[PDB]
Design a protein around this ligand. Sequence first.
Ligand SMILES: CN[C@H](C(=O)Nc1cncc2ccccc12)c1ccc(Cl)c(Cl)c1
Ligand SMILES: CN[C@H](C(=O)Nc1cncc2ccccc12)c1ccc(Cl)c(Cl)c1
Lengths: 300, 305
Amino acid sequence: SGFRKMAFPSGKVEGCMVQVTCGTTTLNGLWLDDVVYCPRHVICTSEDMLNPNYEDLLIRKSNHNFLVQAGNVQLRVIGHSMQNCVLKLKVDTANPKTPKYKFVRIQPGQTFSVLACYNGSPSGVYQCAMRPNFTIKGSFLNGSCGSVGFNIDYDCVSFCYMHHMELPTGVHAGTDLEGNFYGPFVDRQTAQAAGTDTTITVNVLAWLYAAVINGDRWFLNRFTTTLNDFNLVAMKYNYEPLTQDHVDILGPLSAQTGIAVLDMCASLKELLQNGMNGRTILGSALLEDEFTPFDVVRQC
Amino acid sequence: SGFRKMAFPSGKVEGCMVQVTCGTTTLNGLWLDDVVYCPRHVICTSEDMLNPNYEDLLIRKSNHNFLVQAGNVQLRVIGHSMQNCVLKLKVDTANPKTPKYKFVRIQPGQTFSVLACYNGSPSGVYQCAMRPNFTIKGSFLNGSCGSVGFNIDYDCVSFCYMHHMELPTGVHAGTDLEGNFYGPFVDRQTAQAAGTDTTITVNVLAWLYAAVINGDRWFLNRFTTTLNDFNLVAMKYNYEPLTQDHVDILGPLSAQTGIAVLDMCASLKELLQNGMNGRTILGSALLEDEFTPFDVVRQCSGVTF
Ligand SMILES: CN[C@H](C(=O)Nc1cncc2ccccc12)c1ccc(Cl)c(Cl)c1
Ligand SMILES: CN[C@H](C(=O)Nc1cncc2ccccc12)c1ccc(Cl)c(Cl)c1
């Protein structure tokens, strides 16, 4: 019993964190095999940030401009290339702690663990979701760029995010491990703003199922609803519309608790109209949307 | 920016998790040097648990009854002894991944990271607080016993908790790494209940400072209060009393934000009597009490491990 926001054990990712320094900029790098991945903005100065030509700046760099440090050992950069917004530094030593890994691009609503690092040293691990507006609500300070988001499948680390920047509202933007940004963001100091964020409806529903599995039932009702009637109410509360894919994904939890998806949807509709009336669900006074259906099944 | 419930990196602890099997029971063990620590109830069956004489049960066990597995390698148990509610299995091989470590007993209000394990395999990490009633509001399924709680201080792991059981309300009880239970709990299948829990006041204050550091400041007011007036109001809302030690510990945060502790106490006093008025603090509608003052400083300053 119990329900917690739970991150994956970060050990397999800690053994990959290194420090990458280019000139006056120091950030984190992900050392996998003989390659160190890091945000390409490490090659930027003060002048080339509003409108940098990364292809031009990288052509001017030599292997000896990059200083890579893994623990108390300096790694030798023998090559450099750019893949989208990620810089790839070939090194003359393969990481002996390289776990089994994949690079995966996730969709909004998906969750992952973040290993926040500073100077190649892991400082904390927390759980995040890719917001529908493609930002993440992380906890990051200056020097955290290059910190990675990941999930663990048995023994395999799926790297899904690399931290690049903080937007003016305090939310964070980054890329997958192939350097493609999540969202309409660019690694330029140009005026950027996250779109209005919305609630991940399928995740709220999965969390309501987790609460039922844990013995919370006060929010349940005898109503059901149509998917269309639910979406029309949900959207007035800035909730994402629920698709037939989401209803199918909630199937196992529905079978486990004996509460049909559209029956749980009607309970969600009531919570939105009423509020919690001084009550909590799983120790929370707000509806939690950072637990996917797969997270709930895994944890329960 | 941002404020998250954040656990310590669990890597140094993952390299110590092993599987301990005794008869039909399989749980987790903590392998440090040539010793594997695990809950002493691993030697019990369902019948033994009702009224267990652990000293008598352990005397009947031989080293070969314990099956220890580190990854897919079996460790050979060359000795066994009991220290309070923890069983210590001497093995022939010292853990090469043994980090710098200490065994520490924590106080209520203190926080720590839990590496939840099943069959000696780490499955998740989360941050939690030792409640004033000495339970932890964890997330544990069957097989999680032997999962450990820890903090990291520089490059030293301080092991502070080992999971033993789940109480009828769904909250959890365990011991320090010397086998002494936190709280008035016993490792026997008997009627047990956690005492009425209270809020960790010093932690709520630290979290209010974290919110101010993050720009969330609607709850601040012009008022201050005496420590005595604050504690009289706090006592009525099931909040732990705030001591002069707590006021001193909140000092650096008071200096950083420009909000004196008793000034923040007057904000908390109003929040308790009037509520949040439909507003949130750090995206939460409840006052969060599982971040210590040190956790807030560490997170809002980027200390690494
Ligand atoms: C110097 N790196 C920053 C950046 O946002 N860096 C940070 C990352 N995370 C949190 C931070 C909190 C406070 C201050 C900086 C933080 C930056 C600025 C603009 C662009 Cl376009 C890019 Cl790619 C990067
Ligand atoms: C076999 N260990 C169980 C126990 O409570 N085991 C669990 C520990 N954590 C979470 C659980 C969730 C669901 C089911 C079991 C869980 C047990 C029973 C009574 C006593 Cl007195 C003791 Cl010491 C141990």
